[PDB]
Design a binder for this molecule. Structure first.
Ligand SMILES: [Ca+2]
Length: 290
């Protein structure tokens, strides 16, 4: 299509345009955070290791569903659970229109024999051309004039996986700009809105156990499933549609015997495939050229 999901800015709130960090690598949970080098894939043939939350890619616990009306029949694009913005992990790169690259995500070597990972990704293009500072947003409302080091804004705390993502009602901004090469007719630069444009997405759909199921929409993401016969890993060729700055989100799909929600709307499961010691599994993200 793709769908566009339009959010209304509220601070405090779920759609408060919070800041994400390109270095944080540790899983969710208590304890000393682990920061690695910033995950800049510019130039390609780069690889970084990090942990992703158990159900970070698709989790009814987010308490919000979106709908994809570009799907026929329309009932098949309904009630899509979101992912968690901050228990997935973010990276970026600068690239050129036409760049043919390969994204790979697989279990980290330290966890290569531990079942749990089914990595997925979302790739966005940010026409603004670099990190987007927006005063008055959740983490930029104390007089900051710039983003903190190695950080960038994204729309909200729960994320859509197959849509253009738009935030409107932002604190008015007189310097929301894009570089000269950007068609601001097609990609507007509004004083009160910004859009993260969908480029691609996908997830490892190869199950560890044939009898089990993935915590995943029955039909909405049929075009997104990647099967290569290897559970815990995917590879996807991508040709960049635009010159500029890209934002990459990676998160996990959980495999279970069954899942539901409880009275509070929290995920319940039985027979999870989760052999790793923490609340997130370590994966290695690689972008190669070609
Ligand atoms: Ca696979």
């Amino acid at each position: 299509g793709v769908a566009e999901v339009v959010e209304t800015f509220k601070n405090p709130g779920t759609y408060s345009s919070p800041v994400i960090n390109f270095k944080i690598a540790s899983p969710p949970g208590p304890g000393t955070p682990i920061y690695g080098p910033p995950r800049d894939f510019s130039g390609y043939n780069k690889s970084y290791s990090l942990a992703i939350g158990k159900t970070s890619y698709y989790d009814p616990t987010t308490g919000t569903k979106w709908n994809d009306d570009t799907i026929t029949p329309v009932s098949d694009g309904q009630d899509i659970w979101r992912g968690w913005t901050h228990t997935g992990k973010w990276s970026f790169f600068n690239g050129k229109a036409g760049d043919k690259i390969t994204l790979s995500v697989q279990r980290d070597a330290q966890e290569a024999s531990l079942k749990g990972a089914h990595p997925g990704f979302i790739l966005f293009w940010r026409p603004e051309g670099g990190p987007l500072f927006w005063a008055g947003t959740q983490d930029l409302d104390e007089g900051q004039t710039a983003l903190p080091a190695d950080s960038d804004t994204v729309i909200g705390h729960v994320i859509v996986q197959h849509a253009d993502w738009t935030l409107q009602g932002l604190p008015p901004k007189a310097d929301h700009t894009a570089p000269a090469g950007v068609d601001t007719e097609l990609y507007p630069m509004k004083p009160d809105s910004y859009t993260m444009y969908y480029v691609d997405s996908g997830y490892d759909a190869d199950k560890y156990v044939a009898s089990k199921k993935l915590i995943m929409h029955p039909t909405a993401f049929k075009g997104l499933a990647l099967n290569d016969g290897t559970a815990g890993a995917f590879t996807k060729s991508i040709t960049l549609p635009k010159t500029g700055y890209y934002m990459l989100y990676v998160a996990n799909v959980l495999e279970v015997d069954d899942w539901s929600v409880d009275a509070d709307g929290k995920l319940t499961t039985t027979g999870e495939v989760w052999e790793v010691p923490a609340k997130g599994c370590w994966v290695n993200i690689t972008i190669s050229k070609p």
